Amino acid sequence: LQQSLELKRKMLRDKQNKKNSGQHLPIFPAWVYERPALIGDFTALPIGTLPLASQESAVVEDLLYVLVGVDGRYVSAQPLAGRQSRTFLVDPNLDLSIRELVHRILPVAASYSAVTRFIEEKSSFEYGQVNHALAAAMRTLVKEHLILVSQLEQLHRQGLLSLQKLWFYIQPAMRTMDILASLATSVDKGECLGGSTLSLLHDRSFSYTGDSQAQELCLYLTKAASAPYFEVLEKWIYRGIIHDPYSEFMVEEHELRKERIQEDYNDKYWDQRYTIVQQQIPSFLQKMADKILSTGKYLNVVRECGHDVTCPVAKEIIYTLKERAYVEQIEKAFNYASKVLLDFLMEEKELVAHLRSI
Amino acid sequence: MIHELLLALSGYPGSIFTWNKRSGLQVSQDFPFLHPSETSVLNRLCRLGTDYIRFTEFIEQYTGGLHGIYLRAFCTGLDSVLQPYRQALLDLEQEFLGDPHLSISHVNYFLDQFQLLFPSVMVVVEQIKSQKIHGCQILETVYKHSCGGLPPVRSALEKILAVCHGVMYKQLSAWM
Amino acid sequence: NLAAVWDQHLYSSDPLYVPDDRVLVTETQVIRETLWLLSGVKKLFIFQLIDGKVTVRNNIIVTHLTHSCLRSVLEQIAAY
Amino acid sequence: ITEAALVRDILYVFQGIDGKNIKMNNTENCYKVERSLRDTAVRLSELGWLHNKIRRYTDQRSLDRSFGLVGQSFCAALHQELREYYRLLSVLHSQLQSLTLRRLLVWTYDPKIRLKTLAALVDHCQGRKGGELASAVHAYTKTGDPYMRSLVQHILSLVSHPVLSFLYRWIYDGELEDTYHEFFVASDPTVKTDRLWHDKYTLRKSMIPSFMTMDQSRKVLLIGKSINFLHQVCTDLENAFQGKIDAAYFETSKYL
Amino acid sequence: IRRYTDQRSLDRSFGLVGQSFCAALHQELREYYRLLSVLHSQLQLT
Amino acid sequence: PVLSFLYRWIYDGELEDTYHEFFVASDPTVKTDRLWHDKYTLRKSMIPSFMTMDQSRKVL
Questions:
Q1: Out of E12, E13, E20, closest to residue F1 by CB
Q2: How far is E46 from chain A (nearest CA, A)?
Q3: CB–CB of F4 and A210 under 8 A?
Q4: How far apart are CA B105 and CA D62, in angstroms?
Q5: Into which family does the record put it (chain D)?
């Protein structure tokens, strides 16, 4: 809890010193993190003395509350939250059968509390555009889980639901929640951000190829969580622009202008101005990685002289599994980029006559 | 309640929404029928009605103190800015007549666009009263707030101001 | 019910209180009274005139209207 | 204290009116009920507290003409959004004559993110104004989150519409009319006989909005200055600044 | 059946087509639970 | 999965299995002309029962 506050600031400084053209990189107010209610998670009859089938109705009521993260009268969410593994405490004096079924139903609650915490802590600006959309598309599935538990509340109001029927109804969303929570655990544990949290979403999507109950989940999550990175890459390949407000994109722009600003002795535009990062490559694109840097680096230096450069057709790019069509799209952009710059330099800035007159 | 209020928001205060000089249309009673806290909602809403009586008084006395033809033109404009606030109180009653469950909060929502036009026109009117801006300087106090920044009251004061120019383009068209 | 405003006098009954007799005319009839008054007509049961001063009748009540607001609007028509 | 009472009370915290059995007993902290049910109540009432921030800020800042042309429109947009939040709230009232979807945990969820984001915007824009406030708004459209980026980037269109109106008037129209420091240019009156053009108009440096380059600010100053001298003596913008401003520059200069 | 699927899913070394088998082995266990739900529903069924 | 491996192993050309599943098992450390003669082996343990040897010799 307290230990995250450091990590956020330590990341923020790197982006601040990296990028000075874009100033006052945003932050959320302190209470956005301090207030505990904004995040998802935070007269009692003695249960011993009742009949059994009323204990069932009681525990079912408490569990229908637990599914949304809010505590129950007979079952409590333990407040430790050490490491990341949420734990729950059922009342000690219950029927052994019901207690064990409550334990077998409980993992979706531990896999909801961590899932919401991931969405709050990794939706601050500092963690980067990709880690934002991962939480922002995990958040839709959180909403749909809430839809489901609302329908279960209606059925329970009509006295027509039991713990055994609950067990069946929560199976499809138990798999959803387990995939989301393990994926969030891995993303947070690896401190992965940018394309490191676009590689992990590719590898976990290979991990389940025939399941197709979790594969559609992961393919949808990566479709939604790769809209940020690909929008950076889509601009990078078809335009010289690197917004990349935070140091997330694989390509980076070093400020070597401070040294090289007349003769540009360093040949910095093609030596060390636009350089590559190793750990922030998506790793479905390592095959094309160098070509992308070349691709957009060729676009910058015609975007620099004011001659408007635009691709004939800008094709939007979406994450895909089993089918490397992004590869041919990068090549289709690369060859036009090479024509773009070589032609621009050979008609504007027309290099042959310069070389002759040198 | 939902007709007493859809008339108290208009000129006619009623017993529930007692009028007073120091403060206007503050219902102050413990009622079993209304929910305990609905008075607070009603207080926030009665700010709008109170303002409406204040403009209506101001248009009444015009059209030693303040006088002129411009106070006979600004008030005519202040009728027109309030016309969509009358029609929008008719429509509320038309809906409430049929729907029997609809509550006060729809009145709140529907008459929430009129909690930006009114409060920032009220400062214009109190300026015109506290400072005796009687003559041609009325155009100044309208054009100085017409720059604004809040679009509801930037177009409201524009409707007000154009009428004053309508007077000034006949005073300075008879002259020229 | 919101069509029976001030028909319930529970607020008044919170203290001991005597209710006053009132005619209980219909709201629709009130517009008819106003319309003939706004045209040339005298001796209407609403808007009783006394010395050439048309004045709202002292006791008129309606279902979905309280006495005071009804008095206020009716006086405002009677001024015209 | 049955749950039916809590539903009827909680349907007013969202408006921000203290309920019967729910109140802002501690003035700064959120509403506290006077068990599992209680714990549901707080998460639902945080919308009311965020509403208190947004509303209480746009009542007061809307009556303050010192805040400026930019900032009064910011409060405008905040209030137009609170309007749409009240459209939902009215429907909830009508649906009371069950309506406990975990007590609205589903209904409120979508407004709750649209409330967190604006409650963050007002206090990232606290102290700032003009181009600086528009800069803060442009700062908050740097989240991958599509729903939040969509909300903020309509707020920015309204908020920076005055800013770009100054820009598209101080270029095209000829004159600059800001009474407060609402723009990145700072005219100074002086005699200005033969020293006219050198010093009347100067680039202020606190009010250039963050989605503009210093070169762009300097060049727009030169345009506005040319077009005003001509009368008195003679995605930043979807990357449309660099196309429009330079065209105006070329024409204005050669024409001056 | 459920001990096997509870241990296999906890090991990526189990195999990719293996995991396809262990997720096909759950489709035929959910319907078993559905039948159990019906069995419970008719209890107030011998 | 085994008829998707064999459907991207054929029409497009790909052998992606971090685990020992598909019947072909390519050998790395071959960037030379020896891809044809080495680098591919029909592992005779992972050949599925519903195809015979002559069927799988063609597939490799």
A1: E20
A2: 18
A3: yes
A4: 22
A5: Belongs to the TUBGCP family.
Contact between chains at A210 and F8 (C-beta distance less than 8 A):
no
Question: Is chain F touching chain B, with at least 3 CB–CB pairs below 8 Å?
Answer: no
Q: Which of B111, B56, B46, B62 is nearest to B79 (CA)?
A: B56
CA distance linking residue A163 with residue A98, whole number of Å: 9
* Residue B41 and residue B104 in contact, taking contact as beta carbons nearer than 8 Å: yes
CA distances from F26 to F4, F29, F34, F36 (A): 17, 10, 12, 11
> Distance of alpha carbon D217 from its chain centroid, rounded?
22
What are residue B174's phi and psi, to 5 degrees? -70, -35
Question: Which residue of A165, A210, A214 is in closest CB contact with E16?
Answer: A210
The answer to whether B35 contacts D162, with C-beta atoms less than 8 Å apart, is no
Task: Of D9, D56, D51, give the one whose Cα is nearest residue D30.
Answer: D51
Name every chain F residue with its beta carbon within 8 A of the beta carbon of E23.
none
Name residue, tokens 């951000």.
A193
Method: cryo-EM
Residues of D in contact with A21 (CB under 8 A): 213
Give SS3 for C55. coil
The structure tokens 């027509």 sit at: A160
Q: Characterize the bridge pairing of strands D22-23 and D32-33.
A: antiparallel
Query: Which secondary structure element, helix H or strand E, spans residue D232, and what is its range?
Result: helix D214-232
> Would you say D35 and D69 are in contact if contact means Cβ atoms under 8 Å apart?
no
- d(Cα F45, Cα A49) in Å, to the nearest integer? 61
Q: Check CB contact under 8 Å for B102 and D90.
A: yes
Contacts 24+ apart (CB under 8 A), D24-30: D24/D49, D24/D52, D30/A35, D30/A37
Please name the helix (run of DSSP H) or strand (run of DSSP E) that holds residue D200, with its range, or none. none
Query: What is the resolution of the experimental data for this entry, in Å?
Result: 3.7
Q: Which two tokens stand for residue A147?
A: 């839809």
Beta strands in chain D (DSSP E): 22-23, 32-33, 185-187, 201-203
**A105 vs A161: CA distance, rounded Å:** 15
Kindly determine whether residue B108 and residue D71, on different chains, have CB atoms separated by under 8 Å. no
Task: For residues B118 and B152, give the distance between their C-alpha atoms in angstroms, rounded to a whole number.
Answer: 9
* Cross-chain Cβ contact B149/D20 below 8 Å: no
Amino acid in the structure at residue D180: Y
Rounded-to-integer distance, Cα C48 and Cα B85, Å: 33
Residues A232, A238: Cα–Cα separation, whole Å? 10
F35: which DSSP letter? Answer: G
Q: Do chains D and B touch (3 or more CB pairs under 8 A)?
A: yes
Give me the residue from D15, D68, D89 closest to B149, CB to CB: D68
B149 vs D contacts (CB less than 8 Å): 67-73, 76, 162
Nearest CA to C24 out of C55, C72, C57 is that of C57
Q: Read off the tokens for F2.
A: 């085994």
- The Cα A157–Cα A297 span in angstroms is 63
- Alpha-carbon torsion, ordered D133, D134, D136, D139, to 10 deg: 180
Helices (H), ranges, B62-150? 74-98, 104-110, 117-130, 138-146
Retrieve residue D145's tokens.
């989150």
Across the interface, whether the CB atoms of B149 and D82 are under 8 A apart is answered no
Q: Is C54 helix (H, G, I), strand (E, B) or coil?
A: strand
The Cα–Cα gap between D93 and D88 comes to 9
Angle between helix E16-41 and A196-207 (nearest 10): 70
The answer to whether the CB of D51 falls within 8 A of the CB of D114 is no
Which residue in D120, D139, D144 is closest to A24 by CB distance?
D139
> Comparing C-alpha atoms, which of D226, D219, D235, D225 is closest to residue D254?
D226
**Chain F residues touching residue A209 (CB < 8 angstroms):** 1, 4
